[PDB]
Amino acid sequence: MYKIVTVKDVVRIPPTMFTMDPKEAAKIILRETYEGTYDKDEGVILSILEVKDIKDGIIIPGDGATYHEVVFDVLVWEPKIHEVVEGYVADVMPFGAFIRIGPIDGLVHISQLMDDYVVYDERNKQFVGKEKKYLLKIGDLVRARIINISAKSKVIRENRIGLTMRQPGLGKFEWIEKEKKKEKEEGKK
Template sequence: MFVLAKLQDVVRIPPWLFDKSLNEAIAEELNRKLANRVLYSVGLCIALHDVLSLEESFILPGDGASHTKTVFRYTVFRPYVDEVLTGRIKSCSNDGVQVSLGFFDDIVIPPTSLQQPARFDEAEQVWVWEYDNGKHSLFMDPGEEVRFRVAAETFTDTTPAGPELTTADPAAPAADPAQTQQRKTPYVITATINEPGLGLLSWWSNLG
């Protein structure tokens, strides 16, 4: 679930951190910059593990901060495909089930990856497993613990882009770039529970 990613960056240390040791100041700045941030094709950054090397620091003209090229290792959340994890159901919709690990919420179980046969209960807004040919309706209520297998991962580049050229009606209102950016999710895990032993933990304790 967690891996060490070897990264490189030029770390800017502002003057008010000069009273700290270089390693301590760099660690503070790297965690401030990266913690809880998704790096494209790397994963969700959790915390700095260690600093591997530092090059000579320099100060740019007109900037009182120091700049140091740094090679370091960062603890990253990025489960491998087929890894089995346990989380809690955050919500259900016609599009599937959203699962949370507490620190990461972008885990989606599509309808086709649920225990089958399954149906969406519009009144309760939850998915239901029709166990034993419909003799038992097992509800997937929010807050319940669920065991799932990672089926795929999707990274989306959310780097802000420049204005797009368009031939649309100039009188039409322009799209808000900020709103367009907010709709993007940088890292999504697609999961499945359509296997024996997967799904709500309570199912298997009760069925056993």
């Protein structure tokens, strides 16, 4: 889930951008370096916001480009294990369903879709419960729980995320309403 992180960092500013002010040059270098990458501890680097303080450059032998201590805010989205997720199903597959949780997509296994048995109907390439007569189709809006996060590399595409859907308080909003109706009925009896 989205958050703002203030990070201190050293920026290698090449001689070709010596003309512009240090703030914009540091902003650009951080856009090229951090933006669009996955970090193991904070999530997905989405957008560099702004730089507050930039230090004077240090010339080190070998390159001639200036190195500056910088302070900046990065808008980063962090998935957290065992939390709640609001999203829509981007697509479905026989092994699992893809749930849009933000910058990256999550996977809901068919064994975690329903307590009831499910079958992958190929007529519309959609899921359908055996006895509940419920169904999932592309574009449906559902609520699920994140249960597993895996991070291979800094590429956001490769890292995968798996969710759960059977547990109480989750499901399609219509099913949530039906469960609320059942709760009201059992409270009234």
